[PDB]
Design a protein around this ligand. Structure first.
Ligand SMILES: *[C@@H]1O[C@H](CO)[C@@H](O[C@@H]2O[C@H](CO)[C@@H](O[C@@H]3O[C@H](CO)[C@@H](O)[C@H](O)[C@@H]3O)[C@H](O)[C@H]2NC(C)=O)[C@H](O)[C@H]1NC(C)=O
Ligand SMILES: *[C@@H]1O[C@H](CO)[C@@H](O[C@@H]2O[C@H](CO)[C@@H](O[C@@H]3O[C@H](CO)[C@@H](O)[C@H](O)[C@@H]3O)[C@H](O)[C@H]2NC(C)=O)[C@H](O)[C@H]1NC(C)=O
Ligand SMILES: *[C@@H]1[C@H](O)[C@@H](O)[C@H](O)[C@@H](Cn2cc(CCCCC3=C4C(C)=CC(C)=[N+]4[B-](F)(F)n4c(C)cc(C)c43)nn2)[C@H]1O
Ligand SMILES: CCn1cc(CCCCC2=C3C(C)=CC(C)=[N+]3[B-](F)(F)n3c(C)cc(C)c32)nn1
Ligand SMILES: *[C@@H]1O[C@H](CO)[C@@H](O)[C@H](O)[C@H]1NC(C)=O
Ligand SMILES: *[C@@H]1O[C@H](CO)[C@@H](O)[C@H](O)[C@H]1NC(C)=O
Ligand SMILES: *[C@@H]1O[C@H](CO)[C@@H](O)[C@H](O)[C@H]1NC(C)=O
Lengths: 497, 497
């Protein structure tokens, strides 16, 4: 119903400008007639998920690129897509006027926007916090009598999550992850640096830390929120590195294995939260398959573990086939889920590049590669940051698909927002990846899925300068004659019956 | 002979001060009689490779820690230990007056110092250069008619290497590694950032790049320097990373496999440099065993690969057993070699902490862990730097075992120098790692080797604050009653007949 109001900040593409009275949005989602396809197109040149339509034709001739759907060749079911409601994200959202807040939440969570169905919720403070805290900072509280949620949860995160749910048409799944334990549970007695839980799995320190997960889930439940899943620790490898600058808790894979087997698994299993899924790793995929082997070859750990969460920061040297591919082959019934990504974290990168097409293409390239290697979901980091890429108590500034500009009561929707939307809007929970065979080698990135209802979705990313004409064959419905412009991303949808 | 002149800069231990007229040194070995052991001790409290002696007794009784040599259990033979003659290292050494220069070189290379037998030589510029350059910057010079050594080699590096080889009584092995090719051979046309050789292995670009290696070895041979080994690329993974800040050349392990098989192996084999060893990887050991499997399962690549070079920067998430152990199991006739280490490279670390005992324990802990997982040698990075940790054209400053202060015609020998010396001085080329078993759980890091002459060498590191009394048993000679003070490192020597 409303188009992108474009603005250039001198980077390769534009942001879309939203404020208290205006934000780009969609009409109610509908499938066209049997025999018709919808194309959504975004381009570096400025198109933002523009809707066009074409006929599905009876026949096709030529030697051009042909992508044939393999509807009967079935892979993983999708869980979903979304982002992280950090302290930083919550502060940036609530710094907007209430009507601008509502257009930002509708951008992410409504069918008028891109239909996020995953929110990652830090358990207490991380780097994207302005205050260092846990839920149990009173020392030697082993029974966790003094556990409680501060205002960061009760006044900021929890209301924003309810407002997100209220706007959503599809069930939203909450994912919880801790960065640090209380410092009195740790070898080094600090939120950051090299340090693990004191003692060993099975002891008072580890039982207290597992009970903290149940206390967290009890407190959010008091505020009428339920979790889909928790992770065993955010980036457990971080706490093994001397001087790690922010909140962390170190586990070797053996320590994670034994923590899960002895404390976290049983403690959750014997709680009212027994249905909350447990994900292991929550770390760089180069740790696979070794970490999957250590944890899941212990049957007493494996029986508690639903899935393996991965972060994208070292993908450059962790080939998909050797990490995701090999983990799937060894442990096919243990889902893989991407739980954290962002651009701008390198010291030689600027934190925020308003309108960066490169950063959009990093997102869609990552999502396609994950989907081609069995991953069930992909989660962004901060839902929103300021133009500095903050706030962040260690000035570890990064980029976000939405940048809030409080002085103008304005927010900017970057290419990353639309590139993630090409997936999140059009691939509902329960969608299954299906095969998509290329007639010839090509520079395109493409993935096909089937909606639970049986309808088809295909995403085609062109990271080249060259226009590529192509045809998509649905061996049962007919042929889509199309073209993939240079520096474009398309989502195609069509009913099959 | 001449003891350490200690100086504190307010860190956990002292540096040893050297200038034009004074530097700490060793007497020549006295080779103590059968039934006598030598101990060299370094402590955080200020002892620097101090020599003591004790008896070996026929019997022992007690329940304290026993370390038993198993001389019938034979593992890898040692190639040796050393560091890198970077542009920055050479500029720092030549910034001293000649007598001070010679005391620095004797500290590393002479029998009055710590007997280094390895020098890593960058092939043209890296981050520890003040100028960016390769040996063939004239574009499209495919037959490399314009290949030449500049003054960084002909005036600075080559003359220093000649001076170091002359001062050494042990044969010194040179190791060459390139950071970048000429920009006109690269996809990105820059010395840094994401970019590989143009085209594919077997083509004009790859043939030119293989020839460059032979042109390099030809030029150094014109100066009567021969190499023991070359690496296939310094950190090939770095050129797979967007915005990589300094000189690099990206290879996937497949690209490395096919470059070695088609270009570098054949081109070296068909040259006067056919005896120069080729080491693969030259990168983080977390890339093992995957990279070893990719390259060494291709017999046409495997036949040219002598060894696997590893760097230490991601050791924190790459456990020795799962990387070095698994690689040796799968490929036991392919040696493992540590080719690059340094401290201070983390964004949240000071580059140089003069007197840091922590940085010394990091070197010795790494060397012991490497030796216990079949590694045949250990190579430091810059031989010397200034107090800032440079110079460095991208201001990527780090620490070095020797820090040169121009303004005082003075250099400081740091704990890292003495921690490396506890191995390099006492473990010559041809030493063999033997079994060493503990009677109980203990916090000590220990390794035993047999000198080519049959004498024993045991290094014991205590990274704990607690003194640990202990006994070393050699079945051929008896028992050494000793103590490992907290924050100490010992090297024990004794004759076995
Ligand atoms: C929130 O953003 C909206 C969208 O930009 C703002 O609305 C817009 O206000 C500008 C300035 O009045 C309008 O500009 C002009 O357009 C007309 C023709 O369309 C042109 O003749 C003028 O020279 C001028 O360029 C713009 O049309 C208008 N857009 C819409 C969709 O209404 C709005 O003012 C912002 N709200 C707040 C609270 O700041
Ligand atoms: C090079 O380094 C050496 C070692 O630090 C410097 O030697 C030290 O020089 C000072 C200044 O002369 C000496 O001070 C004195 O010691 C005598 C006793 O021997 C005392 O009676 C004097 O009144 C004075 O305190 C110091 O002892 C000496 N140490 C050693 C081990 O020789 C040397 O001066 C430095 N040279 C240059 C050119 O920088
Ligand atoms: C996820 C966290 O949970 C969030 O708290 C955080 O905000 C977010 C963003 N982020 C990412 C980082 C840096 C991670 C990787 C750094 C890394 C690299 C990389 C990318 C290249 C090279 C080389 N290295 B490395 F040198 F090998 N290296 C070492 C030695 C250690 C680390 C961490 C890396 N910081 N904030 C996510 O972290
Ligand atoms: C259990 C599944 N589910 C569905 C929904 C959507 C409706 C959210 C309504 C809501 C609530 C609710 C239900 C509880 C609290 C504290 N708030 B709430 F106070 F956080 N809140 C605010 C501030 C606004 C709203 C609309 C709201 N939420 N959870
Ligand atoms: C912790 O909880 C106990 C039990 O309710 C209470 O008596 C005590 O005062 C609390 N301590 C705090 C909040 O420091
Ligand atoms: C390259 O080499 C040729 C000699 O073969 C020489 O004449 C030419 O000037 C060289 N080019 C440069 C730029 O030095
Ligand atoms: C290398 O192979 C070539 C054939 O291309 C041959 O002429 C030459 O003599 C060989 N050289 C050496 C040193 O093996």
């Amino acid at each position: 119903a409303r188009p992108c109001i474009p603005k250039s900040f001198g980077y390769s593409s534009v942001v879309c400008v939203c404020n208290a009275t205006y934000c780009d949005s969609f009409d109610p989602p509908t499938f066209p007639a049997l025999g018709t396809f919808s194309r959504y197109e975004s381009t570096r040149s400025g198109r933002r998920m523009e809707l066009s339509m074409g006929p599905i034709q009876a026949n096709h001739t030529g030697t051009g690129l042909l992508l044939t759907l393999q509807p009967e060749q079935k892979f993983q079911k999708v869980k979903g897509f979304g982002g992280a409601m950090t302290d930083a994200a919550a502060l940036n959202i609530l710094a907007l006027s209430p009507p601008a807040q509502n257009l930002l939440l509708k951008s992410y969570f409504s069918e008028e926007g891109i239909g996020y169905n995953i929110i990652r919720v830090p358990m207490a403070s991380c780097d994207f916090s302005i205050r260092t805290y846990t839920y149990a900072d009173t020392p030697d509280d082993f029974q966790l009598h003094n556990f409680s949620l501060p205002e960061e949860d009760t006044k900021l995160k929890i209301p924003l999550i309810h407002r997100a749910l209220q706007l959503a048409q599809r069930p939203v799944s909450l994912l919880a992850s801790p960065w640090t334990s209380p410092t009195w549970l740790k070898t080094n007695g600090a939120v950051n640096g090299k340090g693990s839980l004191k003692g060993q799995p099975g002891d008072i320190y580890h039982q207290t830390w597992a009970r903290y997960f149940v206390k967290f889930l009890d407190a959010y439940a008091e505020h009428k929120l339920q979790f889909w899943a928790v992770t065993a620790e955010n980036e457990p490898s971080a706490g093994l590195l001397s001087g790690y600058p922010f909140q962390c808790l170190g586990f070797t894979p053996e320590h994670q294995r034994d923590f899960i087997a002895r404390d976290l698994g049983p403690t959750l299993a014997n709680s009212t939260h027994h249905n909350v899924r447990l994900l292991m790793l929550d770390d760089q995929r180069l740790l696979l398959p070794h970490w999957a082997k250590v944890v899941l070859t212990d049957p007493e750990a494996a029986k508690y573990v639903h899935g393996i969460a991965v972060h994208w920061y070292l993908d450059f040297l962790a080939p998909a086939k050797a990490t995701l591919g090999e983990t799937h082959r060894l442990f096919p019934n243990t889902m893989l889920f991407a739980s954290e990504a962002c651009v701008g974290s390198k010291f030689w990168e600027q934190s925020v590049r308003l309108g960066s097409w490169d950063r959009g293409m990093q997102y869609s390239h990552s999502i396609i590669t994950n989907l081609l290697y069995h991953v069930v979901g992909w989660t962004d980091w901060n839902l929103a940051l300021n133009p500095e890429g903050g706030p962040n108590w260690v000035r570890n500034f990064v980029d976000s698909p939405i940048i809030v500009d409080i002085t103008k009561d304005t927010f900017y929707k970057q290419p990353m927002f639309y590139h993630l939307g090409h997936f999140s809007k059009f691939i509902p929970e329960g969608s299954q990846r299906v095969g998509l065979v290329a007639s010839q080698k090509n520079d395109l990135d493409a993935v096909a899925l089937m909606h639970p209802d049986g309808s088809a979705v295909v995403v085609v990313l062109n990271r080249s300068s060259k226009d590529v004409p192509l045809t998509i064959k649905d061996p049962a419905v007919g042929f889509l004659e199309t073209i993939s412009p240079g520096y474009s991303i398309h989502t195609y949808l069509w009913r099959r019956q």
